Amino acid sequence: SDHRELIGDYSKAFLLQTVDGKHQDLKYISPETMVALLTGKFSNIVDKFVIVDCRYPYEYEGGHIKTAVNLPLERDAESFLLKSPIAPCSLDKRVILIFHCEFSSERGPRMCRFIRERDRAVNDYPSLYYPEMYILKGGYKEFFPQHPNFCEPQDYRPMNHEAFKDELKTFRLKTRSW
């Protein structure tokens, strides 16, 4: 039994415990749950889980969660996740996606909604390639101070970092829209 609704293709319940977050309709997990996945607490059930860090490349380069992939542009995310979907090695097992940015307030959530839109578009309702997707509450900023040893390099570079103003500006000119 679970007290929540089913995952996106209505096949089963969400596996992870969720916390309250700004977007009322999205599912958020805490840093602690992120570490349970990374330490293999759900290995019997989760075949693969992809951590999508939606921050700009310099932020990611200054310190990210181990194994995370950096996909800041919608275009990169669609190509990496939807061109050749990442599927479980066993039907019994699940694939899960986790998105986050610096605070998981804007960037993260947006990329998450965008991937579900495209996943809906290319499938017959209600099947999905990624029916179960969460947001890391607090983003890298809250994660780093708590589990520094799960990040590489062991540092944090804010988007607003004074020495990367130029980098910030250059990168935004690469987005599909402002």
Which residues form the interface with Cl ion (CB under 5 A)? 73-74, 175-176
Question: How near is the Cβ of 74 to Cl ion at its closest, in Å?
Answer: 4
Residue 151 annotated in active site: no
Question: How near is the Cβ of 176 to Cl ion at its closest, in Å?
Answer: 4
Q: Which is nearer to Cl ion, 42 or 58 (CB)?
A: 58
CB 139 within 8 A of CB 102: yes
Q: Which is nearer to Cl ion, 54 or 96 (CB)?
A: 54
Choose the catalytic residue: 54, 89, 101, 151: 101
Q: Which two tokens stand for residue 173?
A: 């000119």
Of the candidates 79, 71, 57, 121, the one whose C-alpha atom is nearest the C-alpha of residue 99 is: 71
Question: How near is the Cβ of 108 to Cl ion at its closest, in Å?
Answer: 14
Q: Where are the beta strands (DSSP E) in 21-158?
A: 28-29, 46-53, 64-65, 69-70, 94-100, 133-136, 151-152
CB 104 within 8 A of CB 112: no
Q: What three-state secondary structure class fits 64?
A: strand
Check residue 40 and give left, alpha or beta (phi > 0: left; psi -120 to 50: alpha).
left
Catalytic annotation, residues = 101
